[PDB]
Design a protein around this ligand. Structure first.
Ligand SMILES: [Cl-]
Ligand code: NA
Ligand code: NA
Lengths: 301, 301
């Protein structure tokens, strides 16, 4: 019935985005209940950027140093604290649009939607994956620090990501909403780059199952490999190794298609060792790895 | 700096989505002010599939035949009319979440966001384009009819598409919000299929300009072409011809980068004969045609 990279509807998050200014720096904050969450580096001036002491930088800050704007309304900051790399600003008014939400930390290879904002205003929404090297291959420009990534489960918004910085290659790095970085990154203007990335193998298989449910099936073969034998091949092509937990996760698509996982791995192993022979799968010259099994489950039933 | 495919934030449209039921058929409606818009084929039965006489069928319908549900609230229908292929149900309650909006009819090559919905509930958002053959390559499962396409470039939601039906190849056809189909399609189950699709050349060129802005250089060359020689090559690959209007529109991008339009056309001619050869343009081994010159200029600046 058609297949596309889909983001979650962003309305529940749009009602939470506000503008946070400290000094001359302006970025995005997330207004939930009576706290605004944003990257702590909003308190840095030009001199601190090299190696900032965030402990002493925030002691010196006062509540009135933070301008928080929700549209025309200025929210009064009545407290401030720091949780790892995230700044928490207590305001005097709970957000009446606060959705049902929780903070979650995701694993590499999991997907979520980003609501890209600038100066507090939602600009766009896109679906992405946490790469195995803990970067995000989205692109929002400079002013998008504090934009957030999220999933929606039933009616609950799960916030999993906050944008802090762009890396030299144009990929982005950030934290969960408790301020813990994804990846070996620090929120200082120092020498940082993304490690070598790998392909999220479990998502490629999920997407191969999607191509099979779409009737695109030229790649299916009669053969079956072993998990050990497949990982030796995949690890040589900078593919993430495939675990017994990954196999079980794919189970539903296995029983639905009649393609056992290690049967489908024999297909993927030849695509690795042969290339796609000038063909496409689901209209791609390359193998898509930002569809999880659950993304493939939902978008077909 | 990798230009990703972003949708518009969908919250303003989410607040307009309702569920419309006639008999056993449920689909989505668009609730703006005191009117709900939906595909008129909602009034068809299983006998009415091939050759429904919509004016005969609508006359026989009473306001009480229409069940409209906004969440846990039923909206009473107090009138109904037809405008082309779009049913308009007057309701006794104006939608308090009605945004600033307009209805526009778009041209092939134009992009927009789709809020894919099921039983009146928003499910996902994605970005797409009106194909030259007047179809959409989307993801519409059973009951996705009445989902809408929109842009929100400034403050105003411009509604440009309502989904009516899926064609044999799985692409989608629909109308503008005044009920006029895009392309030669009709809301009957008589045999119909999409014509051969072509690539939106002006959008490919905009995307190459965005790659250069992003710092790609590898596909540039020292050649130019004439507009006529380029169109002879382009059509041999089922690319759309480039008009002088297209050359004018690319003018801004030509001047930001210092690369003449017909200079860039020579690069595209070369990419068609050689392929990517392993390389990627803005993280893609396919030439992307669903990013317009306007989209590029926006997500730059
Ligand atoms: Cl247009
Ligand atoms: Na096989
Ligand atoms: Na050239």
């Amino acid at each position: 019935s058609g297949f596309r990279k889909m983001a979650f509807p962003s309305g529940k998050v749009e009602g939470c985005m506000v503008q946070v200014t400290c000094g001359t720096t302006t970025l995005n904050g997330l207004w939930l209940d009576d706290v605004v969450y944003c990257p702590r580096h909003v308190i840095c001036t030009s001199e601190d950027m090299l190696n900032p002491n965030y402990e002493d930088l925030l002691i010196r800050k006062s509540n009135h140093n933070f301008l928080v704007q929700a549209g025309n309304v200025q929210l009064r900051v009545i407290g401030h604290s720091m949780q790892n790399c995230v700044l928490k600003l207590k305001v005097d008014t709970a957000n009446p649009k606060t959705p049902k939400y929780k903070f979650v930390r995701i694993q590499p290879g999991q997907t979520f939607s980003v609501l890209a904002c600038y100066n507090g205003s939602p600009s766009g929404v896109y679906q992405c994956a946490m790469r195995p090297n803990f970067t995000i291959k989205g692109s929002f420009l400079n002013g998008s620090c504090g934009s957030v990534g999220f999933n929606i489960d039933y009616d609950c918004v799960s916030f999993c990501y906050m944008h802090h910085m762009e890396l030299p290659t144009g990929v982005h790095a950030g934290t969960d909403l408790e301020g813990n970085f994804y990846g070996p990154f620090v929120d200082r203007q120092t020498a940082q780059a993304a490690g070598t990335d790998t392909t999220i193998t479990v998502n490629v298989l999920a997407w191969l199952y999607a191509a099979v449910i779409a009737g695109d099936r030229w790649f299916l073969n009669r053969f079956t490999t072993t998990l050990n034998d497949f990982n030796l091949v995949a690890m040589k092509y900078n593919y993430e190794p495939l675990t017994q937990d990954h196999v079980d996760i794919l189970g539903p698509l296995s029983a639905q298609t009649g393609i056992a996982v290690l049967d489908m791995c024999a297909s993927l192993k030849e695509l690795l060792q042969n290339g796609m022979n000038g063909r496409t799968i689901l209209g791609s010259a390359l193998l898509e790895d930002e569809f999880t099994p659950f993304d493939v489950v939902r978008q077909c039933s």
